[PDB]
Design a protein around this ligand. Sequence first.
Ligand SMILES: CC(C)OCCN1c2nc(N3CCOCC3)cc(=O)n2CC[C@H]1C(F)(F)F
Length: 544
Amino acid sequence: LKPNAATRDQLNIIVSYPPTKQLTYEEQDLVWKFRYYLTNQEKALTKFLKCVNWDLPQEAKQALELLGKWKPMDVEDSLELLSSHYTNPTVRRYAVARLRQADDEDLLMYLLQLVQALKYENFDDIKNGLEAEIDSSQIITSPLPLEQDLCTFLISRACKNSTLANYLYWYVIVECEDQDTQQRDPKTHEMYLNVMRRFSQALLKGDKSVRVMRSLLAAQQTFVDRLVHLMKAVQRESGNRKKKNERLQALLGDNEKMNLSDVELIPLPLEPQVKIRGIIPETATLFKSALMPAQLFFKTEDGGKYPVIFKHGDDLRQDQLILQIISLMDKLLRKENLDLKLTPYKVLATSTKHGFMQFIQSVPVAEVLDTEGSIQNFFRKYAPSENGPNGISAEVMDTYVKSCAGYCVITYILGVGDRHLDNLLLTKTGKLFHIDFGYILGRDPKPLPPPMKLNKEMVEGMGGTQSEQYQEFRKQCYTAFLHLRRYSNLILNLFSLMVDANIPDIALEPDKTVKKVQDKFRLDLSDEEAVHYMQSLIDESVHA
Ligand SMILES: CC(C)OCCN1c2nc(N3CCOCC3)cc(=O)n2CC[C@H]1C(F)(F)F
């Protein structure tokens, strides 16, 4: 009923393990033995529930009396309980009970994963909450004249928060529209339709503002359906990029026919806090790309311009997951008082065949080099300073060093491949950032890719390997690395809820996907060994 000094050390080794590590039979027996002692350690509860054989009624019974007797679990840890591993209704209800403790800010960071976790819920209980044959896109547009589960909870919070409602809407829409899920997992497709029917029904039962949320959601779906129709017409248009652009601007201009240039204020699906009046027809063009994505400028509520990239005939879900992870990693780093001037641009899939991206005015590194000669020359042109380092503004140099460090570590951890200089972007304020995440988690079009994403010209832009800026780069690389290792339990749990998400590079090897991320962290190394390891990576990458 109480362990010795040696046993308490062995127990501490187990509790510290990543959520992925498989507890050995011997480790399991040790956790089951001192299960009453561990009740004071909130971080041990996850290790305890991984010992239980839920198929054995007596093991399940003992395990649940201890769950109510334990020190309440953290919010980051409750994400482990909502995975495919747990079927026990009492455990899954407990996870929702501890998630309820998070604020909406935190809930939005985890919501993409929470929609995926509905795949592990009781489908009948979802169906009973209601009071091909059904078109998912037409639910919201066709209105008719330990107690909460994941579906009830998410809907409860969505009805109180408009930002949360928008993302719950579009995330569930993409899930219903998934053809793979329709063919291979019909009962799952039926569940998602039921989450949408229950969402519509709850909004229709709400107050003045809650009923208007459903109108707004319908107006958004209708707008997106019209934009898709225009995209198909432009993509079909016979001729060159100019023929297609003229057709694009003409259809956008004809507001009576298409209703895209003049609309009553609606939330931009990509970022719902930004209300829009419509698309500016005149500045709308197609990108050179053979995929024919369009650049569209939205007229905002308060007289601004919000440039967007709308893609048609492409699945944006891989880029969506990566940009919400980059957004989360930036949020944890800022929490830890480290602002690395990162660019977590918004991405929102509106279906498996189309979606939005937030356009950030920038110049590819390739173009910078092939027009100005060097990054330092570019910076000297647009941001000069007499007193500044190398005749470049000090702020621009600090932004460039900080962003280079941030993306270097982030793209290392996420195993981002296909890293040429056309998909590495630079801003006149010094912001370096990555785009086009078609290859992640070790994948690359060419064989044996390098683990770190550095090059000659990048270090040149800092003022070479002998500069003070290059020293600060190193300091910021290893500092950010340690910070992200502290949040490894959170990062690994969110990646664990994505194993069945139909993300191409995840779908490849679902079983091996989370260990691929876990390895990058080098949790086997102490914080001091990690600092050296990160510098070895940098030095080996800069020299090669
Ligand atoms: C430099 C820029 C004009 O290059 C456009 C390149 N462009 C693109 N821009 C992204 N940005 C989002 C973040 O702000 C910048 C643009 C993200 C992204 O996925 N892509 C994929 C390749 C092409 C296109 F046209 F096919 F979509």
